[PDB]
């Protein structure tokens, strides 16, 4: 289809430009090319329908250009907000539309906000159901990244982790979650259990014991 | 104006997707818009489907082309999908969509359904309660959704009359296949031992609603 890059960045206040390439009969060929807004978990949201042209909400910050075979995104001023995946559009024939790749658009001038983790042991509910579950929630932080480990004790826990890729949440940050399942027998077999987060060289590390 | 989507969630291989979509505030009548449907896929980007205006103006997507029949209902206000032979390569999030110019821009666009292909059987969520873990003044609870397929599972809380301090976290695939995922809000310290908390917890794909009354513990 379409190509454009598979990521874009730029710091808070500055200029970002993103292409969308096509052949002759695609972008070359005719005008229209319009380009959409994604916010993770949400549905995609016009941006420009024809290459300079504005919807009425759109904000001026997004402008779009287009040179020969190559369509240019170009978001001005850039806002926590703008952070997101956007696509490209344009007509093949007049039997078909066609769809670009997709661009991951962060901004890199943003603060840094550390986790909050809260953990949680099984429940007495489910402990009962002859399973385990801990539940490690992360939220509120950036960058987007983190990582995982388990402690039973001392000694660190491989088997039973299932973790998240982090996700942008409505207040502009990210959240995170992991879980390890156990038997009811390992979970009462130990002195306590510890999840560690890690993120930006600092961690956090919180523990729960079964005496609880 | 706006735009709802319907159909079944999950469907087996080499069996026929339907869908349908209702569209609120708009006629289904004007000069010119086109009406349709795009997807998007995982590990992919946006692919349309095609769209159809009345009398029987259609489009379609070459090789989709060949499987996909669309038609469209006026007078009800509902258009709908079909697509025949789907292979797990179909597994999308569908959206119904608005077209407008012959037409090249999509807007406004539908929420969208999960629609997972898979021979593997429909199960519904476990859901136990997590207790309130502080900070000053606020304390947080939740619910743990476990092992659900396909997806989406949807959480409120007191049936809608909570909304302040609400998170829901995106769910994780496991080794098994089956989903799981949790919802926490935050509330103050000092309600806990007055108000009740209950999570509302919503699986379509197999008919669930489980309301959860989270409990301190002793
Ligand atoms: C697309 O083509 C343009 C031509 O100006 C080029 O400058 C740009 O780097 C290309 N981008 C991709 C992703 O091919
Ligand atoms: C239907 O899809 C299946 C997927 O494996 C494929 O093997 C088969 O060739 C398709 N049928 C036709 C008639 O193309």
């Known amino acids: 289809a379409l190509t454009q890059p598979p990521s874009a960045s730029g710091s808070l206040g500055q200029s970002v430009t993103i292409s969308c390439n096509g052949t002759?009969?695609?972008?070359?060929?005719?005008?229209?090319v319009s380009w959409y807004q994604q916010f993770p978990g949400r549905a995609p949201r016009l941006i420009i329908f024809?290459?300079?042209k504005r919807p009425s909400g759109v904000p001026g910050r997004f402008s779009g250009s287009k040179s020969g075979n190559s369509a240019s995104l170009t978001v001005s001023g850039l806002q926590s907000d703008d952070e997101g995946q956007y696509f490209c559009?344009?007509?093949?024939?007049?039997?078909?539309?066609?769809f670009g790749g997709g661009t991951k658009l962060t901004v890199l001038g943003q603060p840094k906000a550390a986790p909050s983790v809260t953990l949680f042991p099984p429940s007495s509910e489910e402990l009962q159901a002859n399973k385990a579950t801990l539940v490690c929630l992360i939220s509120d932080f950036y960058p987007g990244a983190v990582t995982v480990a388990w402690k039973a004790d001392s000694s660190p826990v491989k088997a039973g982790v299932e973790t998240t890729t982090p996700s942008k949440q409505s207040n502009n940050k990210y959240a995170a979650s992991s879980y390890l399942s156990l038997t009811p027998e390992q979970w009462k077999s130990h002195r306590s259990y510890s999840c560690q987060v890690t993120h930006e060289g600092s961690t956090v590390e919180k523990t729960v014991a079964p005496t609880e | 104006v706006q735009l709802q989507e319907s159909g079944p969630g999950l469907v087996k291989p080499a069996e026929t997707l339907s869908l349908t979509c209702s569209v609120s505030?708009?006629?289904?009548?004007?000069?010119?818009?086109?009406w349709g449907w795009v997807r998007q896929v995982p590990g992919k980007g946006l692919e349309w489907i095609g769209h159809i205006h009345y009398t029987t103006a259609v489009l379609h997507n070459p090789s989709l082309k060949s499987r996909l029949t669309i038609k469209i209902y006026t007078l009800r206000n509902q258009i709908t999908l079909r697509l025949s032979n789907v292979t797990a390569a179909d597994t999308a999030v569908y959206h119904c969509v608005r077209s407008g110019g012959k037409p090249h821009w999509f807007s406004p666009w539908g929420p969208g359904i999960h629609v997972t292909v898979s021979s593997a059987s429909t199960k519904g969520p476990s859901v136990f309660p997590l207790a309130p873990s502080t900070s000053g003044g606020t304390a947080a609870l939740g619910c743990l959704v476990k092992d659900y397929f396909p997806e989406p599972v949807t959480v409120s809380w007191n049936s809608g009359a909570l909304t302040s301090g609400v998170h829901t976290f995106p769910a994780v695939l496991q080794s098994s296949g089956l989903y799981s995922l949790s919802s926490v809000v935050t509330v103050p310290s000092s309600s806990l031992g007055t108000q009740t908390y209950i999570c509302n917890v919503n699986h379509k794909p197999s008919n669930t609603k489980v309301d959860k009354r989270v409990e301190p513990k002793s």
């Open positions: 024809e290459v300079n």
């Open positions: 002759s009969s695609d972008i070359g060929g005719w005008n229209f």
């Open positions: 505030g708009e006629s289904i009548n004007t000069g010119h818009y086109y």
């Open positions: 559009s344009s007509l093949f024939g007049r039997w078909d539309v066609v």
